[PDB]
Amino acid sequence: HKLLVTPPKALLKPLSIPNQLLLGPGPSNLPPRIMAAGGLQMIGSMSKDMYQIMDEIKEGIQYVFQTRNPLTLVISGSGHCALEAALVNVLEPGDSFLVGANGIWGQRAVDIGERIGVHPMTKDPGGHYTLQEVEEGLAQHKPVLLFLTHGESSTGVLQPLDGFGELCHRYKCLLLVDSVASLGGTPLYMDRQGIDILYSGSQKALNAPPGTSLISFSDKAKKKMYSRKTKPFSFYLDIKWLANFWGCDDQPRMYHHTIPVISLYSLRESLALIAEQGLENSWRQHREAAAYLHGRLQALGLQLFVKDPALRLPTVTTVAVPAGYDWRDIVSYVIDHFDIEIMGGLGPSTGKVLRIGLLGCNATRENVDRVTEALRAALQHCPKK
Amino acid sequence: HKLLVTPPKALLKPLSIPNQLLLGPGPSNLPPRIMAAGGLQMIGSMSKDMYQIMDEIKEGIQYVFQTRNPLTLVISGSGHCALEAALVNVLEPGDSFLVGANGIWGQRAVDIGERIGVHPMTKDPGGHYTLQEVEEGLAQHKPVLLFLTHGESSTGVLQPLDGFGELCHRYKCLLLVDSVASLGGTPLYMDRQGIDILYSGSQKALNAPPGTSLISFSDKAKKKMYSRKTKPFSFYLDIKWLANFWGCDDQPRMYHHTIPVISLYSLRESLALIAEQGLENSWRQHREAAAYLHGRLQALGLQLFVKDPALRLPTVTTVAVPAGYDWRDIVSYVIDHFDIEIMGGLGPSTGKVLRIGLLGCNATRENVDRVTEALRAALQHCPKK
Ligand SMILES: *Cc1c(COP(=O)(O)O)cnc(C)c1O
Ligand SMILES: *Cc1c(COP(=O)(O)O)cnc(C)c1O
């Protein structure tokens, strides 16, 4: 007759969160202004004010992406969810998709592609793709879309994109780019680089809480989407509905799903923040911090996974795991003795490296100092064969 | 040579949000404790502390759902996203899905079902489904899964579920229930009612910000999922990955996607809140407010769309639009002159009704007072043929 479950004891306690300095590939710490944004009251998801904040975020995405694409908006999901929305609306079953698979991300792009109806232009962690090699790929399969990771956060590789725009439009192919870890930390120009679909996450250099993602479509990728004959497998990610709600259409905004309002307040303020600083300074800040961090690490004796500075993702550095060390001890030592988070590999780079992230408000010399003296400490106290 | 887009002027201004009393079908206003949760700093998405908060939320979902299902967790998306995750992992292409389509929600369930590979047991806004009629449906198509809306927020209909558990297990059919608008506001017992998949939203009676959703699978629906031969079209919604991250497996938590950490802090506190109050009181609060509100409205002259109190969703009441009135004026009048939000129809009920929502901390006599004197005012000042 009764209620099977009783109120959980743990919930009857107060929520208590540790203070951790997030210096890994994401999420990153939140500036005071973003936290304040997080604690505001709620407004109607379809109110005139919500739309206004929505338009500002759009102008915000056009600026950080550097595009004028009308089809620009926020995906109410994390990084993956933006990738998936990209693929599920552009790729129609059996389409030939060439994938720059040199990190867990390309790996993820294949999986999604397979699942929805693919050519694994494979590499090894640490490698990138030459303008040369992609023609070779565009050659055989003449795919309708190519996938490239700008900032490969699982390997630390910064991937060059100048020209590819054309090398793809050449073969009547759409260019899809992942700038989840690169946005705000290295130069990127969607239009001038002829990228067709660009997506990014909110919790990396932008310092917004995780859960939302940014996306933009060129008139080219747009036309393919509005004239496919199949309806994309997903309703939650349907750009036709999505675009209309975000005001990208000629029609009145129609109810699709309830946007994550509080997260939008936060994303808006994080876009305001980089708009006040300016992309060029943010680019200079990250480059400088990444340079400082590289110096210190080599001084500690560790060597950089990515041999060649031009190919090093400023926002995420991949150090090679030291000699007779179990990386796990190092990571544990740092979070245990200094309250600092840093990671190990991910996918192909698993156990081969340590990843140190420098993002937005955390990409400072001060934190490079802290993670250096943390790492050094680990190095002298952690077991060693 | 330059940057095409310049920092948006609007973003250079401070974020300013109006104070609105949200009394429509969602989202709802946030108690002080949830807002505080929203403004906390970030922690690692895979830290031991994040997992602890994750387990508490799980215990939290088992309690509000009233189940012990190990396969219980949060979907990093809104209500739809939980429905979609439900359907995309249970239904395999060409499966026969019987859908209680009596509101925009069944409508949504068909669309998703079609998109992924369906029997529209149609009704009219205001109607519900008799234990009788579903056998008739389970009869013809002998579908592997049935979809039922517990709280139809677009029509105001509270749908009875006692027995259906069996009337479905009878025909070897899985029972899928939508308790996005009913959870916390009317009695629901997942196990005792033999529901197989139950999902709810975070922004309705729970008073958490929108963007996350709750889901639970019975051992039955679980087995079908872990032994389908096709991989679900979605990677972001793959329960195999999802379950593992949420600690429902025998394996170490493996990185899938970055959970919306800040939103989880808030959802945890909103679960703590109802755990302190108790489901039975929350059920009593909403029933009582809905009763008070019904009285007042009929006193104002308006009539209730749903004729029969037993079928009236406490959390969302559907009033019929009055005589020579343009509903739009009424809704505008209320948000314009009293800062209060209430809605009109949605889908099948479009323009036929007004929807007044009573949710969680907003389901009070005080707010019933406010929306009554708001509505009355509208009634005397808005145009009338
Ligand atoms: C972190 C990261 C992702 C994943 O974003 P999520 O929000 O965790 O799904 C995707 N791509 C790149 C390059 C990343 O660094
Ligand atoms: C509001 C509502 C939904 C939609 O939830 P979203 O988070 O806006 O996608 C689904 N079902 C019911 C019964 C609802 O009331």
PDB file of N, CA and C in Angstrom, chain B residues 4-78:
ATOM      1  N   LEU B   4      36.051  40.494 -40.347  1.00  0.00           N
ATOM      2  CA  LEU B   4      34.765  40.908 -40.906  1.00  0.00           C
ATOM      3  C   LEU B   4      33.807  41.454 -39.868  1.00  0.00           C
ATOM      4  N   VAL B   5      33.559  40.676 -38.820  1.00  0.00           N
ATOM      5  CA  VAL B   5      32.597  41.103 -37.792  1.00  0.00           C
ATOM      6  C   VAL B   5      33.212  41.857 -36.612  1.00  0.00           C
ATOM      7  N   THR B   6      32.574  42.925 -36.196  1.00  0.00           N
ATOM      8  CA  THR B   6      33.061  43.693 -35.068  1.00  0.00           C
ATOM      9  C   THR B   6      32.273  43.293 -33.817  1.00  0.00           C
ATOM     10  N   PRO B   7      32.879  43.441 -32.632  1.00  0.00           N
ATOM     11  CA  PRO B   7      32.180  43.070 -31.396  1.00  0.00           C
ATOM     12  C   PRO B   7      30.767  43.624 -31.373  1.00  0.00           C
ATOM     13  N   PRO B   8      29.749  42.769 -31.214  1.00  0.00           N
ATOM     14  CA  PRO B   8      28.363  43.279 -31.191  1.00  0.00           C
ATOM     15  C   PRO B   8      28.068  44.335 -30.085  1.00  0.00           C
ATOM     16  N   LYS B   9      27.504  45.469 -30.501  1.00  0.00           N
ATOM     17  CA  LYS B   9      27.163  46.547 -29.573  1.00  0.00           C
ATOM     18  C   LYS B   9      26.278  46.091 -28.409  1.00  0.00           C
ATOM     19  N   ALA B  10      25.256  45.305 -28.725  1.00  0.00           N
ATOM     20  CA  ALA B  10      24.305  44.807 -27.718  1.00  0.00           C
ATOM     21  C   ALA B  10      24.988  44.015 -26.600  1.00  0.00           C
ATOM     22  N   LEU B  11      26.040  43.280 -26.961  1.00  0.00           N
ATOM     23  CA  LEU B  11      26.773  42.480 -26.004  1.00  0.00           C
ATOM     24  C   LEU B  11      27.610  43.336 -25.091  1.00  0.00           C
ATOM     25  N   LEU B  12      27.900  44.561 -25.514  1.00  0.00           N
ATOM     26  CA  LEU B  12      28.732  45.434 -24.702  1.00  0.00           C
ATOM     27  C   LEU B  12      27.901  46.039 -23.583  1.00  0.00           C
ATOM     28  N   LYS B  13      26.624  45.711 -23.593  1.00  0.00           N
ATOM     29  CA  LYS B  13      25.752  46.183 -22.541  1.00  0.00           C
ATOM     30  C   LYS B  13      25.626  45.064 -21.513  1.00  0.00           C
ATOM     31  N   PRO B  14      25.103  45.408 -20.335  1.00  0.00           N
ATOM     32  CA  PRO B  14      24.906  44.444 -19.246  1.00  0.00           C
ATOM     33  C   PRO B  14      23.658  43.603 -19.541  1.00  0.00           C
ATOM     34  N   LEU B  15      23.674  42.351 -19.083  1.00  0.00           N
ATOM     35  CA  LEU B  15      22.546  41.438 -19.227  1.00  0.00           C
ATOM     36  C   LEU B  15      21.415  41.917 -18.259  1.00  0.00           C
ATOM     37  N   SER B  16      20.207  42.150 -18.751  1.00  0.00           N
ATOM     38  CA  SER B  16      19.131  42.581 -17.843  1.00  0.00           C
ATOM     39  C   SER B  16      17.864  41.762 -18.033  1.00  0.00           C
ATOM     40  N   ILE B  17      17.425  41.051 -17.003  1.00  0.00           N
ATOM     41  CA  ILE B  17      16.239  40.242 -17.230  1.00  0.00           C
ATOM     42  C   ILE B  17      15.024  40.710 -16.432  1.00  0.00           C
ATOM     43  N   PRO B  18      13.855  40.810 -17.093  1.00  0.00           N
ATOM     44  CA  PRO B  18      12.600  41.244 -16.467  1.00  0.00           C
ATOM     45  C   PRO B  18      12.157  40.286 -15.358  1.00  0.00           C
ATOM     46  N   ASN B  19      11.348  40.744 -14.417  1.00  0.00           N
ATOM     47  CA  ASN B  19      10.885  39.820 -13.393  1.00  0.00           C
ATOM     48  C   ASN B  19       9.524  39.408 -13.916  1.00  0.00           C
ATOM     49  N   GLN B  20       9.350  38.104 -14.160  1.00  0.00           N
ATOM     50  CA  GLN B  20       8.073  37.558 -14.648  1.00  0.00           C
ATOM     51  C   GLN B  20       7.613  36.394 -13.743  1.00  0.00           C
ATOM     52  N   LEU B  21       6.317  36.370 -13.449  1.00  0.00           N
ATOM     53  CA  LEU B  21       5.744  35.328 -12.617  1.00  0.00           C
ATOM     54  C   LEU B  21       5.275  34.289 -13.629  1.00  0.00           C
ATOM     55  N   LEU B  22       5.986  33.157 -13.661  1.00  0.00           N
ATOM     56  CA  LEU B  22       5.700  32.097 -14.637  1.00  0.00           C
ATOM     57  C   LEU B  22       4.596  31.144 -14.179  1.00  0.00           C
ATOM     58  N   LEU B  23       3.416  31.353 -14.739  1.00  0.00           N
ATOM     59  CA  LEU B  23       2.248  30.566 -14.410  1.00  0.00           C
ATOM     60  C   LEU B  23       1.639  29.909 -15.621  1.00  0.00           C
ATOM     61  N   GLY B  24       2.490  29.441 -16.532  1.00  0.00           N
ATOM     62  CA  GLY B  24       2.043  28.736 -17.716  1.00  0.00           C
ATOM     63  C   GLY B  24       2.526  27.290 -17.595  1.00  0.00           C
ATOM     64  N   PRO B  25       2.374  26.474 -18.650  1.00  0.00           N
ATOM     65  CA  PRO B  25       2.818  25.076 -18.597  1.00  0.00           C
ATOM     66  C   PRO B  25       4.331  24.812 -18.497  1.00  0.00           C
ATOM     67  N   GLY B  26       5.143  25.846 -18.276  1.00  0.00           N
ATOM     68  CA  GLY B  26       6.582  25.646 -18.152  1.00  0.00           C
ATOM     69  C   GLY B  26       7.348  26.578 -19.065  1.00  0.00           C
ATOM     70  N   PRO B  27       8.585  26.953 -18.714  1.00  0.00           N
ATOM     71  CA  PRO B  27       9.306  26.563 -17.502  1.00  0.00           C
ATOM     72  C   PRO B  27       8.637  27.286 -16.323  1.00  0.00           C
ATOM     73  N   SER B  28       9.044  26.943 -15.121  1.00  0.00           N
ATOM     74  CA  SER B  28       8.497  27.569 -13.945  1.00  0.00           C
ATOM     75  C   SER B  28       9.601  28.366 -13.234  1.00  0.00           C
ATOM     76  N   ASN B  29       9.181  29.215 -12.315  1.00  0.00           N
ATOM     77  CA  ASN B  29      10.114  30.013 -11.513  1.00  0.00           C
ATOM     78  C   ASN B  29      10.973  29.148 -10.624  1.00  0.00           C
ATOM     79  N   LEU B  30      12.149  29.662 -10.302  1.00  0.00           N
ATOM     80  CA  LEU B  30      13.086  28.959  -9.471  1.00  0.00           C
ATOM     81  C   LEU B  30      13.160  29.465  -8.000  1.00  0.00           C
ATOM     82  N   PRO B  31      13.055  28.548  -7.034  1.00  0.00           N
ATOM     83  CA  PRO B  31      13.142  28.903  -5.623  1.00  0.00           C
ATOM     84  C   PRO B  31      14.546  29.458  -5.413  1.00  0.00           C
ATOM     85  N   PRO B  32      14.768  30.178  -4.298  1.00  0.00           N
ATOM     86  CA  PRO B  32      16.076  30.765  -3.990  1.00  0.00           C
ATOM     87  C   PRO B  32      17.193  29.764  -3.944  1.00  0.00           C
ATOM     88  N   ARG B  33      16.893  28.571  -3.428  1.00  0.00           N
ATOM     89  CA  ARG B  33      17.897  27.523  -3.296  1.00  0.00           C
ATOM     90  C   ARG B  33      18.425  26.984  -4.666  1.00  0.00           C
ATOM     91  N   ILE B  34      17.543  26.960  -5.659  1.00  0.00           N
ATOM     92  CA  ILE B  34      17.933  26.479  -6.971  1.00  0.00           C
ATOM     93  C   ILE B  34      18.831  27.551  -7.610  1.00  0.00           C
ATOM     94  N   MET B  35      18.422  28.817  -7.511  1.00  0.00           N
ATOM     95  CA  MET B  35      19.270  29.897  -8.050  1.00  0.00           C
ATOM     96  C   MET B  35      20.672  29.884  -7.435  1.00  0.00           C
ATOM     97  N   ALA B  36      20.753  29.646  -6.136  1.00  0.00           N
ATOM     98  CA  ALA B  36      22.066  29.614  -5.486  1.00  0.00           C
ATOM     99  C   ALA B  36      22.925  28.492  -6.091  1.00  0.00           C
ATOM    100  N   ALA B  37      22.260  27.378  -6.383  1.00  0.00           N
ATOM    101  CA  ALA B  37      22.884  26.195  -6.967  1.00  0.00           C
ATOM    102  C   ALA B  37      23.406  26.570  -8.365  1.00  0.00           C
ATOM    103  N   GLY B  38      22.630  27.386  -9.048  1.00  0.00           N
ATOM    104  CA  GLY B  38      23.032  27.820 -10.371  1.00  0.00           C
ATOM    105  C   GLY B  38      24.282  28.666 -10.413  1.00  0.00           C
ATOM    106  N   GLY B  39      24.585  29.412  -9.340  1.00  0.00           N
ATOM    107  CA  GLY B  39      25.753  30.278  -9.320  1.00  0.00           C
ATOM    108  C   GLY B  39      27.033  29.717  -8.733  1.00  0.00           C
ATOM    109  N   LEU B  40      27.108  28.408  -8.534  1.00  0.00           N
ATOM    110  CA  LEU B  40      28.315  27.841  -7.954  1.00  0.00           C
ATOM    111  C   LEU B  40      29.412  27.638  -9.005  1.00  0.00           C
ATOM    112  N   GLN B  41      30.645  27.512  -8.521  1.00  0.00           N
ATOM    113  CA  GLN B  41      31.785  27.333  -9.392  1.00  0.00           C
ATOM    114  C   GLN B  41      31.716  25.939  -9.976  1.00  0.00           C
ATOM    115  N   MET B  42      32.535  25.682 -10.975  1.00  0.00           N
ATOM    116  CA  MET B  42      32.562  24.409 -11.667  1.00  0.00           C
ATOM    117  C   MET B  42      33.504  23.338 -11.055  1.00  0.00           C
ATOM    118  N   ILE B  43      33.159  22.061 -11.216  1.00  0.00           N
ATOM    119  CA  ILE B  43      34.086  21.013 -10.767  1.00  0.00           C
ATOM    120  C   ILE B  43      34.338  20.102 -11.975  1.00  0.00           C
ATOM    121  N   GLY B  44      35.299  19.196 -11.863  1.00  0.00           N
ATOM    122  CA  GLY B  44      35.601  18.295 -12.967  1.00  0.00           C
ATOM    123  C   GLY B  44      34.435  17.368 -13.315  1.00  0.00           C
ATOM    124  N   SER B  45      34.110  17.271 -14.603  1.00  0.00           N
ATOM    125  CA  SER B  45      32.983  16.434 -15.039  1.00  0.00           C
ATOM    126  C   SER B  45      33.162  14.960 -14.755  1.00  0.00           C
ATOM    127  N   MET B  46      34.364  14.564 -14.378  1.00  0.00           N
ATOM    128  CA  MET B  46      34.612  13.163 -14.080  1.00  0.00           C
ATOM    129  C   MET B  46      35.290  12.999 -12.742  1.00  0.00           C
ATOM    130  N   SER B  47      35.200  14.025 -11.911  1.00  0.00           N
ATOM    131  CA  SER B  47      35.797  13.977 -10.586  1.00  0.00           C
ATOM    132  C   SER B  47      34.997  13.028  -9.667  1.00  0.00           C
ATOM    133  N   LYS B  48      35.580  12.649  -8.546  1.00  0.00           N
ATOM    134  CA  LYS B  48      34.871  11.765  -7.637  1.00  0.00           C
ATOM    135  C   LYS B  48      33.639  12.493  -7.081  1.00  0.00           C
ATOM    136  N   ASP B  49      33.775  13.797  -6.860  1.00  0.00           N
ATOM    137  CA  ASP B  49      32.662  14.613  -6.360  1.00  0.00           C
ATOM    138  C   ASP B  49      31.504  14.743  -7.324  1.00  0.00           C
ATOM    139  N   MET B  50      31.815  14.867  -8.608  1.00  0.00           N
ATOM    140  CA  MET B  50      30.760  14.924  -9.625  1.00  0.00           C
ATOM    141  C   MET B  50      29.972  13.595  -9.587  1.00  0.00           C
ATOM    142  N   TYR B  51      30.669  12.478  -9.428  1.00  0.00           N
ATOM    143  CA  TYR B  51      30.015  11.175  -9.399  1.00  0.00           C
ATOM    144  C   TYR B  51      29.103  11.054  -8.200  1.00  0.00           C
ATOM    145  N   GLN B  52      29.569  11.561  -7.064  1.00  0.00           N
ATOM    146  CA  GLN B  52      28.779  11.528  -5.852  1.00  0.00           C
ATOM    147  C   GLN B  52      27.465  12.283  -6.062  1.00  0.00           C
ATOM    148  N   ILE B  53      27.530  13.461  -6.698  1.00  0.00           N
ATOM    149  CA  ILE B  53      26.334  14.289  -6.921  1.00  0.00           C
ATOM    150  C   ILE B  53      25.448  13.531  -7.887  1.00  0.00           C
ATOM    151  N   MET B  54      26.105  12.828  -8.810  1.00  0.00           N
ATOM    152  CA  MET B  54      25.415  11.999  -9.802  1.00  0.00           C
ATOM    153  C   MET B  54      24.664  10.843  -9.124  1.00  0.00           C
ATOM    154  N   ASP B  55      25.308  10.169  -8.185  1.00  0.00           N
ATOM    155  CA  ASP B  55      24.607   9.103  -7.508  1.00  0.00           C
ATOM    156  C   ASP B  55      23.400   9.662  -6.719  1.00  0.00           C
ATOM    157  N   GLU B  56      23.585  10.809  -6.044  1.00  0.00           N
ATOM    158  CA  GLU B  56      22.486  11.394  -5.274  1.00  0.00           C
ATOM    159  C   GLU B  56      21.297  11.703  -6.182  1.00  0.00           C
ATOM    160  N   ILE B  57      21.569  12.197  -7.389  1.00  0.00           N
ATOM    161  CA  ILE B  57      20.490  12.523  -8.311  1.00  0.00           C
ATOM    162  C   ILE B  57      19.785  11.233  -8.722  1.00  0.00           C
ATOM    163  N   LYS B  58      20.546  10.146  -8.822  1.00  0.00           N
ATOM    164  CA  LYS B  58      19.957   8.877  -9.197  1.00  0.00           C
ATOM    165  C   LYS B  58      18.987   8.432  -8.108  1.00  0.00           C
ATOM    166  N   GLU B  59      19.467   8.439  -6.869  1.00  0.00           N
ATOM    167  CA  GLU B  59      18.618   8.077  -5.731  1.00  0.00           C
ATOM    168  C   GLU B  59      17.407   9.005  -5.737  1.00  0.00           C
ATOM    169  N   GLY B  60      17.653  10.250  -6.155  1.00  0.00           N
ATOM    170  CA  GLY B  60      16.620  11.262  -6.249  1.00  0.00           C
ATOM    171  C   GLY B  60      15.592  10.863  -7.287  1.00  0.00           C
ATOM    172  N   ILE B  61      16.021  10.374  -8.455  1.00  0.00           N
ATOM    173  CA  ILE B  61      15.045   9.970  -9.473  1.00  0.00           C
ATOM    174  C   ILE B  61      14.237   8.704  -9.081  1.00  0.00           C
ATOM    175  N   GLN B  62      14.881   7.766  -8.385  1.00  0.00           N
ATOM    176  CA  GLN B  62      14.251   6.532  -7.956  1.00  0.00           C
ATOM    177  C   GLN B  62      13.111   6.878  -7.010  1.00  0.00           C
ATOM    178  N   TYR B  63      13.363   7.836  -6.116  1.00  0.00           N
ATOM    179  CA  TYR B  63      12.368   8.310  -5.190  1.00  0.00           C
ATOM    180  C   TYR B  63      11.179   9.025  -5.857  1.00  0.00           C
ATOM    181  N   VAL B  64      11.410   9.991  -6.740  1.00  0.00           N
ATOM    182  CA  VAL B  64      10.261  10.691  -7.365  1.00  0.00           C
ATOM    183  C   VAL B  64       9.526   9.835  -8.382  1.00  0.00           C
ATOM    184  N   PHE B  65      10.248   8.867  -8.940  1.00  0.00           N
ATOM    185  CA  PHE B  65       9.623   7.923  -9.847  1.00  0.00           C
ATOM    186  C   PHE B  65       9.042   6.773  -9.014  1.00  0.00           C
ATOM    187  N   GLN B  66       9.674   6.451  -7.896  1.00  0.00           N
ATOM    188  CA  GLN B  66       9.220   5.329  -7.082  1.00  0.00           C
ATOM    189  C   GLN B  66       9.565   4.045  -7.891  1.00  0.00           C
ATOM    190  N   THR B  67      10.856   3.738  -7.922  1.00  0.00           N
ATOM    191  CA  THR B  67      11.375   2.586  -8.609  1.00  0.00           C
ATOM    192  C   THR B  67      12.729   2.258  -8.035  1.00  0.00           C
ATOM    193  N   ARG B  68      13.193   1.058  -8.315  1.00  0.00           N
ATOM    194  CA  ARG B  68      14.510   0.663  -7.852  1.00  0.00           C
ATOM    195  C   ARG B  68      15.356   0.323  -9.068  1.00  0.00           C
ATOM    196  N   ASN B  69      14.820   0.587 -10.265  1.00  0.00           N
ATOM    197  CA  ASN B  69      15.540   0.298 -11.516  1.00  0.00           C
ATOM    198  C   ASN B  69      16.974   0.797 -11.511  1.00  0.00           C
ATOM    199  N   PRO B  70      17.940  -0.110 -11.743  1.00  0.00           N
ATOM    200  CA  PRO B  70      19.350   0.317 -11.758  1.00  0.00           C
ATOM    201  C   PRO B  70      19.567   1.204 -12.986  1.00  0.00           C
ATOM    202  N   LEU B  71      18.813   0.927 -14.041  1.00  0.00           N
ATOM    203  CA  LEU B  71      18.993   1.751 -15.201  1.00  0.00           C
ATOM    204  C   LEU B  71      18.152   3.029 -15.053  1.00  0.00           C
ATOM    205  N   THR B  72      18.668   3.925 -14.191  1.00  0.00           N
ATOM    206  CA  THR B  72      18.061   5.232 -13.925  1.00  0.00           C
ATOM    207  C   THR B  72      19.086   6.389 -14.016  1.00  0.00           C
ATOM    208  N   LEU B  73      18.760   7.411 -14.808  1.00  0.00           N
ATOM    209  CA  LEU B  73      19.671   8.526 -14.971  1.00  0.00           C
ATOM    210  C   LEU B  73      19.097   9.794 -15.654  1.00  0.00           C
ATOM    211  N   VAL B  74      19.977  10.782 -15.791  1.00  0.00           N
ATOM    212  CA  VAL B  74      19.623  12.084 -16.373  1.00  0.00           C
ATOM    213  C   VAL B  74      20.011  12.186 -17.842  1.00  0.00           C
ATOM    214  N   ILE B  75      19.127  12.703 -18.669  1.00  0.00           N
ATOM    215  CA  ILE B  75      19.463  12.901 -20.069  1.00  0.00           C
ATOM    216  C   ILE B  75      19.901  14.378 -20.204  1.00  0.00           C
ATOM    217  N   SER B  76      21.069  14.599 -20.780  1.00  0.00           N
ATOM    218  CA  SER B  76      21.575  15.963 -20.960  1.00  0.00           C
ATOM    219  C   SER B  76      20.886  16.587 -22.100  1.00  0.00           C
ATOM    220  N   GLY B  77      19.576  16.790 -21.966  1.00  0.00           N
ATOM    221  CA  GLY B  77      18.770  17.447 -22.974  1.00  0.00           C
ATOM    222  C   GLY B  77      17.430  17.751 -22.305  1.00  0.00           C
ATOM    223  N   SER B  78      16.513  18.392 -23.034  1.00  0.00           N
ATOM    224  CA  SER B  78      15.198  18.755 -22.521  1.00  0.00           C
ATOM    225  C   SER B  78      14.241  17.565 -22.608  1.00  0.00           C
TER     226      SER B  78
END
